[PDB]
Amino acid sequence: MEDFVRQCFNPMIVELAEKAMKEYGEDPKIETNKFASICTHLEVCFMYSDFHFIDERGESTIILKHRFEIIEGRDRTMAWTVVNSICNTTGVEKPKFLPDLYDYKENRFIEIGVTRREVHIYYLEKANKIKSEKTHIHIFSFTGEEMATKADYTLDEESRARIKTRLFTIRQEMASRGLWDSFRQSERGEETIEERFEITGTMRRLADQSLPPNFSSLENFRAYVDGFEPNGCIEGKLSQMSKEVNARIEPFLRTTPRPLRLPDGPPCSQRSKFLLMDALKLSIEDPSHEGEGIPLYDAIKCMKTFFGWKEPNIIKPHEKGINPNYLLTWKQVLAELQDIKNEEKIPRTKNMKKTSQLKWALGENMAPEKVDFEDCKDVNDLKQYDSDEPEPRSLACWIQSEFNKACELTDSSWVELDEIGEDVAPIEHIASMRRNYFTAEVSHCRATEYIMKGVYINTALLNASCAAMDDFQLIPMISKCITKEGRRKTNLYGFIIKGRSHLRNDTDVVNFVSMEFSLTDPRLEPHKWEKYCVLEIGDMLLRTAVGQVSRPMFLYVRTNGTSKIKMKWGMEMRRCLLQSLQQIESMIEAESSVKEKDLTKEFFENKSETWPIGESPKGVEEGSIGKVCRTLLAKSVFNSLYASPQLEGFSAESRKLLLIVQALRDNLEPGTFDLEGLYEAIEECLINDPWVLLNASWFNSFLTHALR
Amino acid sequence: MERIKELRDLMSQSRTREILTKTTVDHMAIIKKYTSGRQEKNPALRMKWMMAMKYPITADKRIMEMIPERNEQRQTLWSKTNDAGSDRVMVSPLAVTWWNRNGPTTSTVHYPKVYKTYFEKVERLKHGTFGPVHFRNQVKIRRRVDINPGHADLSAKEAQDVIMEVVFPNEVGARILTSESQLTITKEKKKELQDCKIAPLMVAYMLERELVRKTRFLPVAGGTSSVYIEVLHLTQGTCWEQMYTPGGEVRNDDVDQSLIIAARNIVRRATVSADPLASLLEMCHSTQIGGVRMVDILRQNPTEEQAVDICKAAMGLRISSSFSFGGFTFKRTSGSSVKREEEVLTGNLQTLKIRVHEGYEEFTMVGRRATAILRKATRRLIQLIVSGKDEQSIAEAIIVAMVFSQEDCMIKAVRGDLNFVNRANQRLNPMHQLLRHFQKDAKVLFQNWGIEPIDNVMGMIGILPDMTPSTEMSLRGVRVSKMGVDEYSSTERVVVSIDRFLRVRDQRGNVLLSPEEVSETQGTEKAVLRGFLILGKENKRYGPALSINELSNLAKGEKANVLIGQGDVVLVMKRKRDSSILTDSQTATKRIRMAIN
Amino acid sequence: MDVNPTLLFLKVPVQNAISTTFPYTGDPPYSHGTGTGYTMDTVNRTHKYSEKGKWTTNTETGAPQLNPIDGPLPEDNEPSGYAQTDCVLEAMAFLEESHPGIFENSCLETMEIVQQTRVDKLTQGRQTYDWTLNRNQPAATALANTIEVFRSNGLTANESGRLIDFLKDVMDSMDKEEMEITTHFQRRTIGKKKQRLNKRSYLIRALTLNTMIATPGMQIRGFVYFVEALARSICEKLEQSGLPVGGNEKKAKLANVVRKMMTNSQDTELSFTITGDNTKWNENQNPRMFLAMITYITRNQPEWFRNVLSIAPIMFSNKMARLGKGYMFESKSMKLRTQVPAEMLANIDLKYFNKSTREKIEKIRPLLIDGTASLSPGMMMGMFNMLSTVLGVSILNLGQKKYTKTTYWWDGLQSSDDFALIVNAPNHEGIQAGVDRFYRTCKLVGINMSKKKSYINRTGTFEFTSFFYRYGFVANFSMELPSFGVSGINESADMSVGVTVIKNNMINNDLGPATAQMALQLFIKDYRYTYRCHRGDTQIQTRRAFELGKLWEQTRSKAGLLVSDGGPNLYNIRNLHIPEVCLKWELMDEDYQGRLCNPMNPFVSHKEIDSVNNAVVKSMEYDAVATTHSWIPKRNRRGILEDEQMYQKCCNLFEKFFPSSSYRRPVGISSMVEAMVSRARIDARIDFESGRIKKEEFAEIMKICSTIEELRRQ
Numbered sequence A: 001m002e003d004f005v006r007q008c009f010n011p012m013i014v015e016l017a018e019k020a021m022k023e024y025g026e027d028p029k030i031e032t033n034k035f036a037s038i039c040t041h042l043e044v045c046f047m048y049s050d051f052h053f054i055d056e057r058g059e060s061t062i063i064l065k066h067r068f069e070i071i072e073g074r075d076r077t078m079a080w081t082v083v084n085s086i087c088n089t090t091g092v093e094k095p096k097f098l099p100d101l102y103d104y105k106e107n108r109f110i111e112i113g114v115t116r117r118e119v120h121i122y123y124l125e126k127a128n129k130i131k132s133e134k135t136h137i138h139i140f141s142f143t144g145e146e147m148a149t150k151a152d153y154t155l156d157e158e159s160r161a162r163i164k165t166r167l168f169t170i171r172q173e174m175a176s177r178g179l180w181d182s183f184r185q186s187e188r189g190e191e192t193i194e195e196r197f198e199i200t201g202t203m204r205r206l207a208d209q210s211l212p213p214n215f216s217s218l219e220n221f222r223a224y225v226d227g228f229e230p231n232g233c234i235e236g237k238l239s240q241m242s243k244e245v246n247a248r249i250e251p252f253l254r255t256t257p258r259p260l261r262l263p264d265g266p267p268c269s270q271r272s273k274f275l276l277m278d279a280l281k282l283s284i285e286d287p288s289h290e291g292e293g294i295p296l297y298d299a300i301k302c303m304k305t306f307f308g309w310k311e312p313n314i315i316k317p318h319e320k321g322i323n324p325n326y327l328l329t330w331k332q333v334l335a336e337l338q339d340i341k342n343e344e345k346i347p348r349t350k351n352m353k354k355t356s357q358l359k360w361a362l363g364e365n366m367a368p369e370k371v372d373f374e375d376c377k378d379v380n381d382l383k384q385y386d387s388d389e390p391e392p393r394s395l396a397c398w399i400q401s402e403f404n405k406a407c408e409l410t411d412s413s414w415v416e417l418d419e420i421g422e423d424v425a426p427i428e429h430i431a432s433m434r435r436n437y438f439t440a441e442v443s444h445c446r447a448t449e450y451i452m453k454g455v456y457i458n459t460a461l462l463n464a465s466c467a468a469m470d471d472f473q474l475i476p477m478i479s480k481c482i483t484k485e486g487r488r489k490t491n492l493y494g495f496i497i498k499g500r501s502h503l504r505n506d507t508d509v510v511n512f513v514s515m516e517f518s519l520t521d522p523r524l525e526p527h528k529w530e531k532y533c534v535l536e537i538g539d540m541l542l543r544t545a546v547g548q549v550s551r552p553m554f555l556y557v558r559t560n561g562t563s564k565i566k567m568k569w570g571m572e573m574r575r576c577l578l579q580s581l582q583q584i585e586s587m588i589e590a591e592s593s594v595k596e597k598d599l600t601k602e603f604f605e606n607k608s609e610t611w612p613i614g615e616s617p618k619g620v621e622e623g624s625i626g627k628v629c630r631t632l633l634a635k636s637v638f639n640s641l642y643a644s645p646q647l648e649g650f651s652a653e654s655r656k657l658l659l660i661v662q663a664l665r666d667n668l669e670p671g672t673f674d675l676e677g678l679y680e681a682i683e684e685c686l687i688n689d690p691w692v693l694l695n696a697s698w699f700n701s702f703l704t705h706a707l708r
Numbered sequence B: 001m002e003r004i005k006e007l008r009d010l011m012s013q014s015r016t017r018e019i020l021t022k023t024t025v026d027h028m029a030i031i032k033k034y035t036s037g038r039q040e041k042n043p044a045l046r047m048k049w050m051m052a053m054k055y056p057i058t059a060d061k062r063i064m065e066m067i068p069e070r071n072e073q074r075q076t077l078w079s080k081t082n083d084a085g086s087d088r089v090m091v092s093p094l095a096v097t098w099w100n101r102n103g104p105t106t107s108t109v110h111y112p113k114v115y116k117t118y119f120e121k122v123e124r125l126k127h128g129t130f131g132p133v134h135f136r137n138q139v140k141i142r143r144r145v146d147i148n149p150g151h152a153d154l155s156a157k158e159a160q161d162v163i164m165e166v167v168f169p170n171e172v173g174a175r176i177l178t179s180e181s182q183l184t185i186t187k188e189k190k191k192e193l194q195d196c197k198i199a200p201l202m203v204a205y206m207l208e209r210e211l212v213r214k215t216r217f218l219p220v221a222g223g224t225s226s227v228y229i230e231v232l233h234l235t236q237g238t239c240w241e242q243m244y245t246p247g248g249e250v251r252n253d254d255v256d257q258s259l260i261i262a263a264r265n266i267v268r269r270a271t272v273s274a275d276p277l278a279s280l281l282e283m284c285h286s287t288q289i290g291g292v293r294m295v296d297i298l299r300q301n302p303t304e305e306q307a308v309d310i311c312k313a314a315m316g317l318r319i320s321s322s323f324s325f326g327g328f329t330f331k332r333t334s335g336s337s338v339k340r341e342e343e344v345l346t347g348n349l350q351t352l353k354i355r356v357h358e359g360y361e362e363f364t365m366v367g368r369r370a371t372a373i374l375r376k377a378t379r380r381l382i383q384l385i386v387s388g389k390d391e392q393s394i395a396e397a398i399i400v401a402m403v404f405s406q407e408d409c410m411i412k413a414v415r416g417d418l419n420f421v422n423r424a425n426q427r428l429n430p431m432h433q434l435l436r437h438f439q440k441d442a443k444v445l446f447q448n449w450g451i452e453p454i455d456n457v458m459g460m461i462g463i464l465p466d467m468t469p470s471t472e473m474s475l476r477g478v479r480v481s482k483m484g485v486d487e488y489s490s491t492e493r494v495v496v497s498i499d500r501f502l503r504v505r506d507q508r509g510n511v512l513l514s515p516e517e518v519s520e521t522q523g524t525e526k527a528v529l530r531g532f533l534i535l536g537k538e539n540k541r542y543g544p545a546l547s548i549n550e551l552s553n554l555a556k557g558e559k560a561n562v563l564i565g566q567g568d569v570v571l572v573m574k575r576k577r578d579s580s581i582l583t584d585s586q587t588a589t590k591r592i593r594m595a596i597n
Numbered sequence C: 001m002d003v004n005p006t007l008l009f010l011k012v013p014v015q016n017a018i019s020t021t022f023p024y025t026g027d028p029p030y031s032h033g034t035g036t037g038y039t040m041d042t043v044n045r046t047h048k049y050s051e052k053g054k055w056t057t058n059t060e061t062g063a064p065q066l067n068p069i070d071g072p073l074p075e076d077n078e079p080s081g082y083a084q085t086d087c088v089l090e091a092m093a094f095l096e097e098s099h100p101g102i103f104e105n106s107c108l109e110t111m112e113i114v115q116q117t118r119v120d121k122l123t124q125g126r127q128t129y130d131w132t133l134n135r136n137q138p139a140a141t142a143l144a145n146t147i148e149v150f151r152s153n154g155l156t157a158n159e160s161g162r163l164i165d166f167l168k169d170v171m172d173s174m175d176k177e178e179m180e181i182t183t184h185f186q187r188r189t190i191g192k193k194k195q196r197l198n199k200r201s202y203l204i205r206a207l208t209l210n211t212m213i214a215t216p217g218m219q220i221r222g223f224v225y226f227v228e229a230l231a232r233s234i235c236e237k238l239e240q241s242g243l244p245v246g247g248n249e250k251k252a253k254l255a256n257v258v259r260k261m262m263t264n265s266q267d268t269e270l271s272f273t274i275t276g277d278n279t280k281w282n283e284n285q286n287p288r289m290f291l292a293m294i295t296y297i298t299r300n301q302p303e304w305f306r307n308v309l310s311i312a313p314i315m316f317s318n319k320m321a322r323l324g325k326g327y328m329f330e331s332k333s334m335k336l337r338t339q340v341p342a343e344m345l346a347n348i349d350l351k352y353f354n355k356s357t358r359e360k361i362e363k364i365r366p367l368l369i370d371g372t373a374s375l376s377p378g379m380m381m382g383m384f385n386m387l388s389t390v391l392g393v394s395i396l397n398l399g400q401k402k403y404t405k406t407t408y409w410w411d412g413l414q415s416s417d418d419f420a421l422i423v424n425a426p427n428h429e430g431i432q433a434g435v436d437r438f439y440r441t442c443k444l445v446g447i448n449m450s451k452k453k454s455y456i457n458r459t460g461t462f463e464f465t466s467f468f469y470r471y472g473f474v475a476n477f478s479m480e481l482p483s484f485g486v487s488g489i490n491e492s493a494d495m496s497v498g499v500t501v502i503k504n505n506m507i508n509n510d511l512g513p514a515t516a517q518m519a520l521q522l523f524i525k526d527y528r529y530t531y532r533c534h535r536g537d538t539q540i541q542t543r544r545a546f547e548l549g550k551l552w553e554q555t556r557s558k559a560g561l562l563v564s565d566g567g568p569n570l571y572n573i574r575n576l577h578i579p580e581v582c583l584k585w586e587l588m589d590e591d592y593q594g595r596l597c598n599p600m601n602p603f604v605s606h607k608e609i610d611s612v613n614n615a616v617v618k619s620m621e622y623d624a625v626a627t628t629h630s631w632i633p634k635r636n637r638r639g640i641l642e643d644e645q646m647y648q649k650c651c652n653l654f655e656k657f658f659p660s661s662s663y664r665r666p667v668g669i670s671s672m673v674e675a676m677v678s679r680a681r682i683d684a685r686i687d688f689e690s691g692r693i694k695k696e697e698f699a700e701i702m703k704i705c706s707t708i709e710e711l712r713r714q
Ligand SMILES: [Mg+2]
Pocket: C275, C276, C277, C418, C419, C420, C463, C464, C465
């Protein structure tokens, strides 16, 4: 607003307005509405008296002597002197108040005013104020309106149009700058008033009640603050408060730290969505059959490649569920498979008939009814929702074995990344080299199998959920792969049955039952599969040095739930790839900086440099670049699969201890104040998660190594 | 018709009528922000879900007449449905692909013209040249840099005006119809886009993108030109670098140098003048730089120099609370100091009247080839740090810093007279003379300045008096960083006072800028629908209102009613007197200026 | 052999390999850790920290209130909010002394912001507690509803169109004796409902925080907004602050401070760095302290400005915290579940709740008024971050050697939540004394540094807001990897956004070349899957595959077709910045080029400029050619407004007559209806003149326009 006034008008007029206001002891920086009003006043005044002159014969002319004389731009004494001189020389009568301009051709004092409101009202106010018929009045409006006595407008149409248009453009610019409203508001009759915002009524009492103890009124507090000067208040307070309020540095030197204590209890149980290291896949090396591509056709063809369907029987019971209903679900799945096989008209999707076993398996209608508390307030059994402490558990070795099997390679390639533009720049070529090396490093790793399997599972689940709103859809768990012979192989891990998919929010859950084939025996580690139901569904011949040995082929059935957000997070698992690379490339680049040359080949093909990437009874184990590549990829993929709040809490509260110990290693003489508090905060995060307990064990091992 | 009937329907209801009649067009955009819908959180998940549906794409009613209901395979392209809130029929991606493969065809002659920016990027890439990569430690100094080459560097307001005249011919505001400078670019674009069926909003946005300037704070390690920023990803890395050159056309202007020279001349010729303030103001108001008045350039260009800063202070504006001393932009960061006047006798028996800062102040200096920090006590140099590409930059920066310190130690280290006089034969102030003298030779001062040992640590090295790296010994509070120092992150603009002598004084009574600090170097200077005046509100006698596009038929001086702005009918006329709004108030300006003084 | 990646920290320093200590890449899919019990714990702990203060009874809401200010000096190391006003005033005085004129210039800029701002700015906030409907609602809808209620209650200052006018309207409202709320029943038949709120009920509703962490109503948005503007202005001029800078400037600030503190250290001075966090930031920041510091900041200023700035702390000091949905009760005997709203929590027996909840309810009962707990001391997150940063920077600046009077002296940054001190002194005794003095002064001002989360090590290494500094190398992981999946605007917008985000990560986020190539590969695969636009040659049997196959079999230059039309991907580190349609414009076939870019296609839609070629996430802008693939997807979907879309309906049919209205904020003094009327009359006249319209349409249009005129005049 003030900046707009300074920029839009001639700077000299700004100076005149500043002087005129300063005559009254005002600062424009505190009041700008008056400043803008005065600037507009001076601008319109000087516009009125411009380009007018008196000819030789006395007639008016446009370009001698100025026909109009300005009085408003001058001081009080100067303006009064000039008006008196005009009165004496031309014998004019003294107006009761100081005019703005003097017209020589008609010899009369004309007052001029620019009004933000209607013209007529301002005309009436001016007439009532002056109370004299010897002064002409000319009122302009920013909107394009004007008025004067008898409509005897002194100027010609051209000059009136110029003034109208200048004011109109000023109004448009003020409006477009978001200041027109305040400008129009500040005009009150014939004066411009400062913006007012005073605390009265409710806020007065509230402020009286929101002050320090030794004050009673907001005004008293303001007076105290205004008159305050810094005289050793802080020094006196420090000299008063007891020494017990202090931050003491506790030395931290090679002996203080201790391992993190894991929670005691029974061994922890698997909780992954799907089987990871115990899965079995029915394979077709080349799907070259009719109607290929549809998941149902591929699933059926994979099914037909296996024989050994024997009568299933509960092996590891669902301790909480109803095992015979799971058995009946599997039997219905098989029967529907045979039926569709003999139909000979396999459609794109298969919808399962609703049944007692299906409805119970997917948790259909097993939910307490909602009632008003007052209606059932007399129930003795009524009690707040159970939200007690989760059962502490113990780290079980199955997690370590799963991770170890995750960070190892496979027989085929589990990634088919898409194409990019041809490399031209040399850096593009180096990037292609590095990307291809990393891809070959982890194009077959197990974690990549997990990524592809989960991606396909969740994609099919969500697509069926949207397409089949109120049907039970049978979704085979299928994956594609490239064998060492370079053949498009298809693998069937199992089947999934989805319940009601009338999903509206991103957190409400759809319940499904997943039946994954397997070759492990749950009875070996029952606590691992305490959420699963296992049916020995067949026998499979496995080849070994002693020929073909028959083994029992199991089928883990479980009931799970997935939310839209969880399905999306499942389909995002491929991003895990990037994470791994982003941690190795930096290292590569780092060494390049210290060597001033590329190091992709001397790292991805030297196979001599190593990093400590594990533990063994002999000591610490060192691994090559590929070992670290797949280790980090597996860690990222598992973090995706075993995400839990306790994981992030422990990570955040353990980073601090990591940094403290590292600072000690760098000989920086670290110190701490309440280290036991940090230990307690870290320990609070270890309750039940297998992943978090494993990470805690890893940190204990690392601390043990680093301390020595 | 549809529009007026819909307006009648809206007027029928009480509330819609009340909102129509109450709210003024000024506040229209305020009632455009009152949306009762709900923004979709996580739109990626929503899109994934939507794509699975049968008809997730919304098309318009007319599609029913061009795209048949089903294709050869009897797939359903569009469905007889409507969207939630409008009459947008529902169609599938099949409809889009069918339109692409079998829809009616036209000529995209204007697409390159509307989209000149993107095609310019294409051309710049297509003609580039590459070079061998180099692997080494990279230092990316952070600074502000252009974004889009090909811009006219117009102010947002000017770009909006140009767009409004180009694509909205008969809806232009009052400022244009009361304007004289019909920019050449506007007519060029109007000729270019004669018959363009592209959506006018798209054309407006593209012109805005093409004609506006944009600046971003980035870490760069090489070329800073606009065409060198659009490929910063391809050019600079954390451990590598890429040799590249765009192969298009550069549009490096020179108006900045012209403004430098103009301001320098104005200050040099007004400092000796009787009334420098009013004189310089009159000059700046009546001077033209390549066909444009200098006031617009001063208000627009973000130049930083002593002459232009003093010009702003005289005219009245905000300038950085810092001074560019010895070719380096300075900036206070911490501490406070008080200015005290004193007389100092040098080593050449020369008495100089100086003003020294007493206090524990800290400054950061950014030069053309170096970056430095300086902590100074009361007439005591405490700490000095510098980093520069070359040794000569290091030396000049350190010389500037030490002369700024104004310590007593160097006073006795002055050898030779200090009688330097600028090209105008005006006596130079003592600090500038000392700066030039120490530029000429400072070996004697280096020998007698101060020498002390320094502990060895990573990232920083010492300097011996002969300006050579050292790890075991350096000069008092003098050190050099092996890694580049990031420039100042922000600048503080505060109200300042200017005296008739063109000296800018801070609110605390200290002086900020002086003409003597200005370098004296010399350079080389590298159916128009306008002219209408309104006549108040609409007048019925003159006849039915006309559209702006048809104003051209008006006779000389004939007055009619036309709709300007977004629906404001006003009475306008053609001009008869060949003048403009610029010369108004000038005569009365000078008259009242004489009266006040 | 057992894989144990933590051992990797025996060779690669922790800072270098910090990427491994960040598990998630994106938002974890559980979003838990909030509830009514949490609000009870927060209230109880906040009143516990300040318990030793004075207990008063508010005269308006009748709720008890606590005053720890100027309380007895803390005697132990437990967190205490017993700040002293004299000490904070002295600290602010020293801060002004060392940075003269900062308060004044900040005040001038804040005055400008106050004067120029607009009401509609409040539609740019997050989810807001609409008091009228007594529930959370969008910012835009909440503002429209509050405007409707004020209009029905004879308060129309906000009609002027200024935020300060809306603040004056709220001022008028809260002193009103009664407030009348009207609601419609939208089905079957429609009715009306009227509700009357006394002074105290509306007062409580205005000072409420719906907890879902919490969000205040439209009553207390503007005052905090202006105080935030002031705090931001003050902080922009402070070097030691940490806000509101971005990622690139944070590294520069860290490097500057560390170099300043280290190099200036002489050979005989020992330096240390304390990486620290604050015990409980928002639970020990008494609003009275902020009021005192604002009073000092706005000394010698216009009274209206002082009052507008002082209302926010005054309002916050007597605020009410809502208790969310309530509780859930489950009975196993009859498997019966019920929901008990928190309102009756005041007068419900204490047998349905476990021991911990029993303690919570027992402690919070005396402070519960009308279903809301009175929380005078302490604060909530996300509102006064900048002013707290200013106070922290003030206490840091107090460390200058002149103030300490002794050898030791300190400096460092402060970003509200966390901080990093640096202390220089002759001996380790000096370091201890300096840290002790800093700690005691922070306690006196009312700031508690988390002793457990804060550790001290010799200068050279530290952390600050996820920025890890190690001997000059700064690692950034504040946001970690972004989302590389299709954002979900449309085909072209998603493609442009993906390529642009990859490019921006490469430029700023230190991403690598090979990493960028892999990200592009993953993004293109995701795009092709999502939009059913697989390669025309490949057989994947999607819904769209047949038409793409026909198109591919039709065209000739198959390298020119867009990705979404079945074409090869041609991106790379070379041309990430080139829009797709341009990048392969030359190769495009003539007929495909004409069809794809036909501007008369019915699938193209353009919205207001603010939403053209720009997406909101913070927001980012992308470049793309408006082709047939720029469609807009389908939309998905007690109310004061009778018709929620009256304003949207009104703005539309303005764009028709005046297309420019979409581009630039139109300005005019005439009311709208007359604008459409005049434009329609002119358009119909010229249309008749041309010869494309006959007499009947002209007569109909003029009759309609005359009738609209009569309707509007009356
Ligand atoms: Mg910290």
